[PDB]
């Protein structure tokens, strides 16, 4: 007999608010970035570098508010954020993603990004095709915001990230969120949408590992020429590698 405990309800309220304080659905800060350029060679890079750097900041802001995250060592906090950042960015971006034209729509035409924009940041379909497939499959899940924020937090607190020291602690924190998500689906998510919803959500986390691996490869290739590295931000270089 599954029931959402007070603690579990408390976890959901906190993650919801954490997300609200770190995702601006008005996209007002986008004016601060270097301008988008579309018409050849990496013209979207300065803009998307800035957007991604901004996004890393918001993801760290979110992770800090995850119940139990603060109990980790500073080393482990660092390991979990460096390895998950790109994945949580891909997940949180689903909120602006649209199946109409398969783009990320951040308010205006200028801040509406399609596959060619992303390729003009230095990416190929080796990444972008699985990325679009991911965004589509996620949108079709029609997650409750409660589920979305839980998935992001579960993604962050993963015990098998390379370099984790206190794996047992990382697992104990994630387990509490996993249990919270599973109970939420049972109690608040009605059928048919609820069918296999947990397994499908975890499947999206596997898809994210593959996307992260391919992003990293294309990033190491991009960031190879110092002229391209120059166009990134200090936070991007520090978090994604130098």
């Amino acid at each position: 007999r599954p029931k959402l405990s007070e603690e579990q309800q408390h976890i959901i309220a906190i993650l919801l608010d954490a997300h609200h304080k770190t995702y601006d659905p008005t996209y007002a800060d986008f004016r601060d970035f270097r301008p988008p350029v579309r018409m050849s060679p990496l013209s979207m890079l300065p803009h998307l570098a800035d957007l991604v750097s901004y996004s890393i900041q918001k993801v760290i802001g979110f992770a800090k508010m995850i119940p139990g995250f603060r109990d980790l060592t500073s080393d482990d906090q660092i390991v979990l954020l460096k390895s998950s950042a790109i994945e949580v960015i891909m997940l949180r971006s689903n909120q602006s993603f649209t199946m109409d034209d398969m783009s990320w729509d951040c308010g205006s035409q200028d801040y509406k990004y399609d596959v060619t924009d992303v390729s003009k940041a230095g990416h190929t379909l080796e990444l972008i095709e699985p990325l679009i497939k991911f965004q589509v499959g996620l949108k079709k899940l029609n997650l409750h915001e409660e589920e979305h924020v839980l998935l992001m937090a579960i993604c962050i607190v993963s015990p098998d990230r390379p370099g984790v020291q206190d794996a047992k602690l990382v697992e104990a924190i994630q387990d509490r969120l996993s249990n919270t998500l599973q109970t939420y689906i049972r109690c608040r998510h009605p059928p048919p949408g609820s069918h296999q919803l947990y397994a499908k959500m975890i499947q999206k986390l596997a898809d994210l590992r593959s996307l992260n691996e391919e992003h990293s490869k294309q990033y190491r290739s991009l960031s190879f020429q110092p002229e391209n590295s120059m166009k990134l931000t200090p936070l991007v270089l520090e978090v994604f590698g130098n």
Binding site: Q57, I60, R70, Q77, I78, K82, P234, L235, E238, V239
Partner: peptide
């Protein structure tokens, strides 16, 4: 490893 900016963004 040396992550001064991430470290600072994480501090309480």
């Amino acid at each position: 490893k040396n992550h001064p900016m991430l470290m600072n963004l994480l501090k309480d």
